[PDB]
Amino acid sequence: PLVIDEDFINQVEKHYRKSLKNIPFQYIVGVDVGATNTRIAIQFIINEDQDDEVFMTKFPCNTSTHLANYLAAYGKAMVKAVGKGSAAGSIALAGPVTGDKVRITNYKEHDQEFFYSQLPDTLFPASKNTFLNDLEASCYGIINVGTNNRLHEFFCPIDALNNYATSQTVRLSDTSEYAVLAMGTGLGTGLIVGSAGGKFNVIPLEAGHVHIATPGVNSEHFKEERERIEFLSQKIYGGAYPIEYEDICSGRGLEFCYEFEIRNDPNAVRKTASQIAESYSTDTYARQAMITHYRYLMKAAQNIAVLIPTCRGVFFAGDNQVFNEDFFKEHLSILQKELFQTHQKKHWLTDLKPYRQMKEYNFNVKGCLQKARELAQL
Numbered sequence: 001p002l003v004i005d006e007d008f009i010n011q012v013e014k015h016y017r018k019s020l021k022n023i024p025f026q027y028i029v030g031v032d033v034g035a036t037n038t039r040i041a042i043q044f045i046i047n048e049d050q051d052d053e054v055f056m057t058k059f060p061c062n063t064s065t066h067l068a069n070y071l072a073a074y075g076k077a078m079v080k081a082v083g084k085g086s087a088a089g090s091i092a093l094a095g096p097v098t099g100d101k102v103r104i105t106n107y108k109e110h111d112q113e114f115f116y117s118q119l120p121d122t123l124f125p126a127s128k129n130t131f132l133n134d135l136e137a138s139c140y141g142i143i144n145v146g147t148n149n150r151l152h153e154f155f156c157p158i159d160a161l162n163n164y165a166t167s168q169t170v171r172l173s174d175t176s177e178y179a180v181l182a183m184g185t186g187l188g189t190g191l192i193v194g195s196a197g198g199k200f201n202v203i204p205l206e207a208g209h210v211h212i213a214t215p216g217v218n219s220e221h222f223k224e225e226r227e228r229i230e231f232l233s234q235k236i237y238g239g240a241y242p243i244e245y246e247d248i249c250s251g252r253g254l255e256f257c258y259e260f261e262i263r264n265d266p267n268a269v270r271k272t273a274s275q276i277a278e279s280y281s282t283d284t285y286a287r288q289a290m291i292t293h294y295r296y297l298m299k300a301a302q303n304i305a306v307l308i309p310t311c312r313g314v315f316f317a318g319d320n321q322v323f324n325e326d327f328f329k330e331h332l333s334i335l336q337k338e339l340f341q342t343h344q345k346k347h348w349l350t351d352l353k354p355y356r357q358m359k360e361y362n363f364n365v366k367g368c369l370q371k372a373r374e375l376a377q378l
């Protein structure tokens with residue numbers, strides 16, 4: 001009763017039939033589990049270690065049970081299509097990885113725990129798999145693009161008026177550390193950490209779930225900032241808890257911000273995150289909600305840069321960042337001031353280099369496939 005993507009499976013079978021019946025081959029698996037959709041990538045390998053074709057599909061999923069069932073079904077279809085299981089598999093999930101489980105933060109709350117044991121061995125063979133956080137996987141994808149000297153094709157300095165970037169102005173130094181943040185359904189955060197010798201490690205973070213502090217009592221917009229922080233505590237938690245960065249820096253958080261802006265307008269109607277991002281030019285409430293949404297993204301990055309004294313750069317990543325580039329560039333001055341000026345430790349941040357993604361790319365799946373490639377020991 002689980003519908004396999006027919007186009008995907010026919011492509012895999014057609015490729016097996018035309019190209020793989022009489023040569024040695026393997027395949028590695030990369031799975032990108034977001035809060036509302038999961039992507040599966042199959043990368044074939046021939047000639048011991050050469051990339052062959054990659055095939056991808058995606059399905060709606062927001063419970064752990066459904067995710068386990070879909071992965072089991074895709075494992076059986078793959079074995080049926082090409083005659084054997086994968087050589088290695090990597091899965092990245094939108095939650096904190098603690099040992100042998102992940103709690104997928106924005107899956108339905110009654111069924112968000114996914115365990116290592118729910119991986120099908122057909123796609124994740126024993127001792128040949130990794131359990132990753134989604135933003136952690138993006139970091140490995142970013143490292144890998146950096147190694148291939150293409151980081152400046154996907155990111156530019158936030159103040160690049162014409163998106164100009166070079167291998168000199170956008171690069172990863174193996175003696176530096178970088179924060180990565182990506183606003184989507186949730187606020188993903190992580191650290192890329194260099195080691196002399198060109199090696200990079202990734203530190204997973206859950207900074208999207210630390211509490212937002214209120215600005216100083218004599219700061220310019222104190223009254224409104226505090227009013228919003230209290231309004232949202234009431235709305236999201238009944239006031240039992242204060243808000244996290246993700247309660248503003250997310251799709252649902254953008255919608256909450258808009259509802260705050262329109263709260264005293266009896267004629268205003270709430271808008272979805274998409275409608276807000278599309279209509280900020282003609283709807284001043286949407287502009288203000290967008291400004292708030294991205295201002296607190298800057299504060300989240302500022303919080304990490306104060307927390308991590310060796311943090312030298314920050315990458316604002318994700319497809320949403322690319323989609324909102326016009327808004328971001330039009331309000332650059334406001335967002336730089338938020339990042340660099342609104343902390344008494346601003347002199348610690350003077351040299352922080354911020355970058356924004358300027359081309360769509362699935363760094364998650366890229367990180368997964370590279371991790372699986374290493375595990376496969378080709």
Ligand SMILES: Nc1ncnc2c1ncn2[C@@H]1O[C@H](COP(=O)(O)OP(=O)(O)NP(=O)(O)O)[C@@H](O)[C@H]1O
Nearest residue numbers: 034035036037184185186251252273274277320323
């Ligand atoms: N331009 C936009 N700006 C901000 N948020 C947006 C925008 N468009 C959509 N959203 C919201 O952002 C979320 C989707 O972000 P996206 O990057 O596509 O996915 P994700 O968080 O990485 N994972 P997934 O839920 O599986 O798609 C939803 O909550 C949308 O309502």
Ligand SMILES: OC[C@H]1O[C@@H](O)[C@H](O)[C@@H](O)[C@@H]1O
Nearest residue numbers: 094095096105135186187188
């Ligand atoms: O998807 C972005 C982020 O969403 C958050 O709610 C999760 O807790 C993180 O683990 C994830 O990286």
